[PDB]
Design a protein around this ligand. Structure first.
Ligand SMILES: Nc1ccc(N)c2c1C(=O)c1c(O)ccc(O)c1C2=O
Length: 327
Protein backbone atom coordinates (compact mmCIF):
# COMPACT_ATOMS: atom_id res chain seq x y z
CA UNK A 1 0.00 0.00 0.00
CA UNK A 2 1.21 3.52 -0.85
CA UNK A 3 -0.26 7.02 -0.52
CA UNK A 4 -2.44 8.06 -3.47
CA UNK A 5 -1.06 11.60 -3.22
CA UNK A 6 2.22 13.23 -2.11
CA UNK A 7 3.93 9.85 -2.18
CA UNK A 8 7.23 11.22 -3.50
CA UNK A 9 7.52 14.42 -1.48
CA UNK A 10 10.39 13.17 0.68
CA UNK A 11 11.93 11.32 -2.27
CA UNK A 12 12.31 14.62 -4.16
CA UNK A 13 13.60 16.59 -1.17
CA UNK A 14 17.16 16.73 0.23
CA UNK A 15 18.07 14.14 2.85
CA UNK A 16 18.41 16.88 5.47
CA UNK A 17 14.72 17.72 5.16
CA UNK A 18 13.58 14.34 6.48
CA UNK A 19 16.70 13.11 8.27
CA UNK A 20 15.72 14.51 11.66
CA UNK A 21 18.35 12.47 13.46
CA UNK A 22 21.07 14.61 11.87
CA UNK A 23 19.41 17.66 13.37
CA UNK A 24 21.62 19.74 15.63
CA UNK A 25 19.47 22.06 17.75
CA UNK A 26 20.37 25.75 18.10
CA UNK A 27 19.22 26.69 21.61
CA UNK A 28 17.76 29.99 22.79
CA UNK A 29 17.65 31.59 26.24
CA UNK A 30 15.20 30.08 28.77
CA UNK A 31 15.12 33.31 30.80
CA UNK A 32 13.52 35.04 27.81
CA UNK A 33 10.21 33.41 28.71
CA UNK A 34 8.28 33.12 31.94
CA UNK A 35 5.43 30.88 33.00
CA UNK A 36 2.30 32.96 33.60
CA UNK A 37 -0.18 30.17 34.18
CA UNK A 38 -0.52 26.48 33.34
CA UNK A 39 -2.99 25.70 30.57
CA UNK A 40 -2.26 22.13 29.53
CA UNK A 41 -0.84 18.88 30.83
CA UNK A 42 -0.06 15.59 29.18
CA UNK A 43 2.10 12.56 29.84
CA UNK A 44 4.52 13.89 27.22
CA UNK A 45 4.68 17.55 28.20
CA UNK A 46 3.28 20.39 30.29
CA UNK A 47 1.96 23.52 28.65
CA UNK A 48 2.01 26.99 30.16
CA UNK A 49 0.68 30.28 28.89
CA UNK A 50 3.76 32.44 29.10
CA UNK A 51 5.18 35.86 28.45
CA UNK A 52 8.30 37.02 26.61
CA UNK A 53 9.83 39.28 29.26
CA UNK A 54 11.81 41.15 26.57
CA UNK A 55 8.67 42.70 25.03
CA UNK A 56 5.55 41.63 26.98
CA UNK A 57 4.49 39.38 24.09
CA UNK A 58 2.33 36.40 25.03
CA UNK A 59 3.47 32.91 24.10
CA UNK A 60 2.96 29.26 24.93
CA UNK A 61 5.68 27.26 26.66
CA UNK A 62 5.57 23.49 26.13
CA UNK A 63 7.96 21.76 28.52
CA UNK A 64 8.64 18.24 27.31
CA UNK A 65 9.01 15.37 29.75
CA UNK A 66 12.21 13.31 29.51
CA UNK A 67 11.97 11.19 26.35
CA UNK A 68 14.39 9.81 23.76
CA UNK A 69 16.49 12.46 22.04
CA UNK A 70 15.43 11.05 18.66
CA UNK A 71 11.72 11.60 19.32
CA UNK A 72 12.29 15.25 20.15
CA UNK A 73 14.58 15.94 17.16
CA UNK A 74 11.76 14.49 15.06
CA UNK A 75 9.16 16.88 16.51
CA UNK A 76 11.46 19.91 16.21
CA UNK A 77 12.43 19.00 12.65
CA UNK A 78 8.79 18.57 11.61
CA UNK A 79 7.80 21.83 13.34
CA UNK A 80 10.60 23.68 11.53
CA UNK A 81 9.64 22.07 8.21
CA UNK A 82 5.98 23.07 8.61
CA UNK A 83 6.44 26.53 10.13
CA UNK A 84 4.52 29.03 8.03
CA UNK A 85 1.93 26.58 6.76
CA UNK A 86 -1.75 27.52 7.12
CA UNK A 87 -3.08 26.96 10.64
CA UNK A 88 -0.07 25.02 11.85
CA UNK A 89 1.35 26.07 15.21
CA UNK A 90 4.51 28.13 14.72
CA UNK A 91 7.64 27.19 16.67
CA UNK A 92 9.40 30.39 17.76
CA UNK A 93 12.20 29.18 20.02
CA UNK A 94 13.68 26.11 21.70
CA UNK A 95 15.18 26.41 25.18
CA UNK A 96 16.31 24.13 28.01
CA UNK A 97 14.11 24.21 31.11
CA UNK A 98 15.78 25.71 34.24
CA UNK A 99 15.58 22.47 36.12
CA UNK A 100 15.50 19.13 34.33
CA UNK A 101 17.26 20.46 31.28
CA UNK A 102 14.46 19.10 29.08
CA UNK A 103 13.84 20.94 25.84
CA UNK A 104 11.05 23.53 26.10
CA UNK A 105 9.32 24.58 22.90
CA UNK A 106 8.12 28.17 22.60
CA UNK A 107 5.08 28.82 20.43
CA UNK A 108 2.86 31.59 19.17
CA UNK A 109 0.13 32.21 21.74
CA UNK A 110 -3.43 30.99 21.16
CA UNK A 111 -6.40 31.80 23.38
CA UNK A 112 -7.99 28.34 23.26
CA UNK A 113 -11.20 27.11 24.91
CA UNK A 114 -11.35 23.38 25.72
CA UNK A 115 -13.54 21.62 23.18
CA UNK A 116 -15.81 20.21 25.90
CA UNK A 117 -16.92 23.79 26.61
CA UNK A 118 -16.56 25.28 23.12
CA UNK A 119 -18.07 22.66 20.83
CA UNK A 120 -21.51 22.73 22.48
CA UNK A 121 -21.75 26.39 21.41
CA UNK A 122 -20.69 25.92 17.78
CA UNK A 123 -23.35 26.57 15.16
CA UNK A 124 -23.88 24.64 11.93
CA UNK A 125 -21.74 27.20 10.10
CA UNK A 126 -19.07 27.31 12.82
CA UNK A 127 -18.38 23.59 12.39
CA UNK A 128 -18.03 23.94 8.61
CA UNK A 129 -15.70 26.90 9.11
CA UNK A 130 -13.38 25.32 11.70
CA UNK A 131 -13.21 21.91 10.02
CA UNK A 132 -12.28 23.74 6.81
CA UNK A 133 -9.46 25.57 8.65
CA UNK A 134 -8.26 22.25 10.08
CA UNK A 135 -8.22 20.68 6.58
CA UNK A 136 -5.98 23.53 5.39
CA UNK A 137 -3.42 22.41 7.99
CA UNK A 138 -3.72 18.72 7.09
CA UNK A 139 -3.42 19.18 3.34
CA UNK A 140 -0.42 21.38 4.03
CA UNK A 141 1.49 18.95 6.23
CA UNK A 142 0.64 16.03 3.93
CA UNK A 143 1.86 18.07 0.92
CA UNK A 144 5.11 18.51 2.88
CA UNK A 145 5.46 14.73 3.35
CA UNK A 146 4.28 14.59 6.96
CA UNK A 147 1.56 12.61 8.75
CA UNK A 148 0.25 14.17 11.98
CA UNK A 149 -0.91 10.82 13.44
CA UNK A 150 -2.70 12.31 16.46
CA UNK A 151 -5.57 14.40 15.11
CA UNK A 152 -8.25 14.94 17.76
CA UNK A 153 -10.06 17.92 19.38
CA UNK A 154 -7.42 18.07 22.12
CA UNK A 155 -4.79 18.95 19.51
CA UNK A 156 -6.82 21.64 17.76
CA UNK A 157 -6.54 25.05 19.45
CA UNK A 158 -9.35 27.48 18.65
CA UNK A 159 -9.62 31.15 19.64
CA UNK A 160 -13.37 31.39 19.09
CA UNK A 161 -13.38 35.15 19.53
CA UNK A 162 -10.85 35.62 16.72
CA UNK A 163 -12.09 32.52 14.84
CA UNK A 164 -8.48 31.33 14.69
CA UNK A 165 -7.49 27.64 14.55
CA UNK A 166 -4.10 25.97 15.06
CA UNK A 167 -3.16 22.29 14.72
CA UNK A 168 -0.79 21.46 17.59
CA UNK A 169 1.24 18.62 19.16
CA UNK A 170 3.37 17.16 16.39
CA UNK A 171 5.12 14.87 18.87
CA UNK A 172 3.74 11.77 17.13
CA UNK A 173 4.04 13.11 13.58
CA UNK A 174 6.32 11.33 11.08
CA UNK A 175 7.74 11.62 7.58
CA UNK A 176 6.00 9.55 4.93
CA UNK A 177 8.25 7.23 2.92
CA UNK A 178 6.65 4.86 0.36
CA UNK A 179 6.50 1.30 1.64
CA UNK A 180 7.74 2.09 5.15
CA UNK A 181 6.13 0.09 7.94
CA UNK A 182 5.16 2.36 10.84
CA UNK A 183 4.23 1.67 14.44
CA UNK A 184 0.50 1.19 14.96
CA UNK A 185 0.59 2.61 18.49
CA UNK A 186 -0.04 6.19 17.40
CA UNK A 187 -3.01 8.55 17.77
CA UNK A 188 -5.44 8.27 20.72
CA UNK A 189 -7.57 5.12 20.95
CA UNK A 190 -10.84 6.82 19.95
CA UNK A 191 -9.29 8.32 16.83
CA UNK A 192 -7.30 5.30 15.68
CA UNK A 193 -8.04 4.21 12.13
CA UNK A 194 -8.85 0.59 11.11
CA UNK A 195 -5.30 0.23 9.77
CA UNK A 196 -3.83 0.71 13.26
CA UNK A 197 -6.32 -1.75 14.75
CA UNK A 198 -5.76 -4.59 12.25
CA UNK A 199 -1.99 -4.03 12.03
CA UNK A 200 -1.70 -2.69 8.46
CA UNK A 201 1.61 -0.94 9.10
CA UNK A 202 2.32 0.57 5.69
CA UNK A 203 -0.29 3.29 6.23
CA UNK A 204 -0.09 6.92 5.10
CA UNK A 205 -1.56 10.44 5.32
CA UNK A 206 -5.02 8.90 5.03
CA UNK A 207 -4.77 7.85 8.69
CA UNK A 208 -5.28 11.52 9.62
CA UNK A 209 -8.41 11.63 7.50
CA UNK A 210 -10.00 8.85 9.56
CA UNK A 211 -9.11 10.68 12.78
CA UNK A 212 -10.62 13.85 11.32
CA UNK A 213 -13.76 11.86 10.54
CA UNK A 214 -14.04 10.66 14.13
CA UNK A 215 -13.65 14.22 15.34
CA UNK A 216 -16.23 15.48 12.83
CA UNK A 217 -18.70 12.72 13.72
CA UNK A 218 -18.40 13.68 17.38
CA UNK A 219 -19.06 17.32 16.52
CA UNK A 220 -22.15 16.97 14.33
CA UNK A 221 -23.70 14.19 16.41
CA UNK A 222 -22.73 15.67 19.80
CA UNK A 223 -21.41 12.25 20.80
CA UNK A 224 -17.82 12.40 22.01
CA UNK A 225 -15.93 10.36 21.44
CA UNK A 226 -17.96 8.90 18.57
CA UNK A 227 -16.27 5.46 18.69
CA UNK A 228 -15.86 4.80 22.40
CA UNK A 229 -13.95 1.53 22.79
CA UNK A 230 -12.58 0.37 26.16
CA UNK A 231 -9.35 -0.87 24.54
CA UNK A 232 -7.81 -1.33 21.08
CA UNK A 233 -9.74 -4.54 20.32
CA UNK A 234 -13.01 -3.00 21.48
CA UNK A 235 -12.25 0.10 19.40
CA UNK A 236 -12.53 -1.97 16.21
CA UNK A 237 -15.69 -3.58 17.60
CA UNK A 238 -17.25 -0.13 18.12
CA UNK A 239 -16.37 0.86 14.54
CA UNK A 240 -17.67 -2.42 13.10
CA UNK A 241 -21.01 -1.91 14.90
CA UNK A 242 -21.49 1.27 12.87
CA UNK A 243 -19.81 0.66 9.52
CA UNK A 244 -20.82 -3.00 9.51
CA UNK A 245 -18.72 -6.15 9.14
CA UNK A 246 -19.45 -6.64 5.43
CA UNK A 247 -17.25 -3.65 4.66
CA UNK A 248 -14.62 -4.90 7.11
CA UNK A 249 -14.46 -8.29 5.35
CA UNK A 250 -13.90 -6.72 1.93
CA UNK A 251 -11.18 -4.51 3.43
CA UNK A 252 -9.35 -7.37 5.17
CA UNK A 253 -9.52 -9.54 2.04
CA UNK A 254 -8.12 -6.75 -0.14
CA UNK A 255 -5.08 -6.31 2.08
CA UNK A 256 -4.92 -10.03 2.81
CA UNK A 257 -5.22 -9.39 6.54
CA UNK A 258 -6.55 -12.00 8.92
CA UNK A 259 -7.66 -10.96 12.42
CA UNK A 260 -6.35 -13.10 15.28
CA UNK A 261 -8.99 -15.46 16.79
CA UNK A 262 -9.84 -13.29 19.82
CA UNK A 263 -10.45 -10.06 17.90
CA UNK A 264 -12.46 -11.82 15.18
CA UNK A 265 -14.77 -13.18 17.89
CA UNK A 266 -15.11 -9.82 19.65
CA UNK A 267 -15.95 -8.12 16.33
CA UNK A 268 -18.77 -10.56 15.56
CA UNK A 269 -21.09 -9.72 12.68
CA UNK A 270 -22.98 -6.44 12.38
CA UNK A 271 -25.18 -4.84 9.76
CA UNK A 272 -24.26 -1.27 8.88
CA UNK A 273 -26.02 1.47 10.88
CA UNK A 274 -27.12 4.41 8.65
CA UNK A 275 -25.62 7.74 9.76
CA UNK A 276 -29.11 9.24 10.13
CA UNK A 277 -29.85 6.77 12.93
CA UNK A 278 -27.50 8.90 15.05
CA UNK A 279 -29.62 12.01 14.64
CA UNK A 280 -31.65 12.95 17.72
CA UNK A 281 -33.09 16.08 19.33
CA UNK A 282 -29.67 17.07 20.69
CA UNK A 283 -27.87 17.22 17.34
CA UNK A 284 -30.61 17.80 14.77
CA UNK A 285 -29.49 21.41 14.33
CA UNK A 286 -26.10 20.11 13.09
CA UNK A 287 -26.98 17.02 11.06
CA UNK A 288 -27.53 17.85 7.40
CA UNK A 289 -27.32 15.69 4.25
CA UNK A 290 -24.10 17.46 3.18
CA UNK A 291 -22.54 16.86 6.61
CA UNK A 292 -23.45 13.17 6.43
CA UNK A 293 -22.13 12.81 2.86
CA UNK A 294 -18.84 14.40 3.88
CA UNK A 295 -18.57 12.27 7.02
CA UNK A 296 -19.37 9.14 5.01
CA UNK A 297 -16.49 9.76 2.63
CA UNK A 298 -14.04 10.11 5.53
CA UNK A 299 -15.04 7.10 7.61
CA UNK A 300 -14.16 4.27 5.23
CA UNK A 301 -12.33 1.13 6.38
CA UNK A 302 -10.10 1.23 3.32
CA UNK A 303 -7.66 4.10 3.82
CA UNK A 304 -7.25 4.29 0.03
CA UNK A 305 -10.97 5.05 -0.35
CA UNK A 306 -10.99 8.03 2.03
CA UNK A 307 -11.10 11.60 0.78
CA UNK A 308 -7.70 13.28 0.71
CA UNK A 309 -7.47 16.59 2.62
CA UNK A 310 -7.40 18.42 -0.72
CA UNK A 311 -10.56 16.63 -1.94
CA UNK A 312 -12.27 17.16 1.41
CA UNK A 313 -11.82 20.94 1.20
CA UNK A 314 -13.77 21.01 -2.08
CA UNK A 315 -16.79 19.08 -0.78
CA UNK A 316 -20.03 21.10 -1.21
CA UNK A 317 -20.43 21.03 2.58
CA UNK A 318 -17.84 23.85 2.74
CA UNK A 319 -19.14 25.79 -0.26
CA UNK A 320 -20.16 28.86 1.79
CA UNK A 321 -16.85 28.81 3.66
CA UNK A 322 -15.03 28.85 0.31
CA UNK A 323 -17.31 31.51 -1.18
CA UNK A 324 -16.75 33.73 1.88
CA UNK A 325 -13.00 33.43 1.30
CA UNK A 326 -13.33 34.04 -2.46
CA UNK A 327 -15.12 37.33 -1.77
N1 LIG B 1 0.95 22.72 22.72
C1 LIG B 1 0.49 24.05 22.37
C2 LIG B 1 1.16 24.73 21.34
C3 LIG B 1 0.76 26.03 20.96
C4 LIG B 1 -0.31 26.68 21.61
N2 LIG B 1 -0.66 27.98 21.20
C5 LIG B 1 -1.01 26.02 22.68
C6 LIG B 1 -0.61 24.68 23.06
C7 LIG B 1 -1.33 23.98 24.17
O1 LIG B 1 -0.98 22.83 24.50
C8 LIG B 1 -2.46 24.65 24.88
C9 LIG B 1 -3.16 23.98 25.95
O2 LIG B 1 -2.80 22.65 26.36
C10 LIG B 1 -4.23 24.63 26.61
C11 LIG B 1 -4.62 25.94 26.24
C12 LIG B 1 -3.95 26.62 25.20
O3 LIG B 1 -4.37 27.92 24.87
C13 LIG B 1 -2.86 25.98 24.51
C14 LIG B 1 -2.14 26.68 23.39
O4 LIG B 1 -2.49 27.82 23.06
Amino acid sequence: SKARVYADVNVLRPKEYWDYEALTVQWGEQDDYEVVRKVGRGKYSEVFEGINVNNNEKCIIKILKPVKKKKIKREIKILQNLCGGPNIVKLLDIVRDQHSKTPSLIFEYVNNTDFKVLYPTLTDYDIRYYIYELLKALDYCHSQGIMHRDVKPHNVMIDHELRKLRLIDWGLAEFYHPGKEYNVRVASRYFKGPELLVDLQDYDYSLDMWSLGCMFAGMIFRKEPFFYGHDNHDQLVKIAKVLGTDGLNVYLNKYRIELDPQLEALVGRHSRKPWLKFMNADNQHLVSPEAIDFLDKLLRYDHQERLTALEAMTHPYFQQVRAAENS
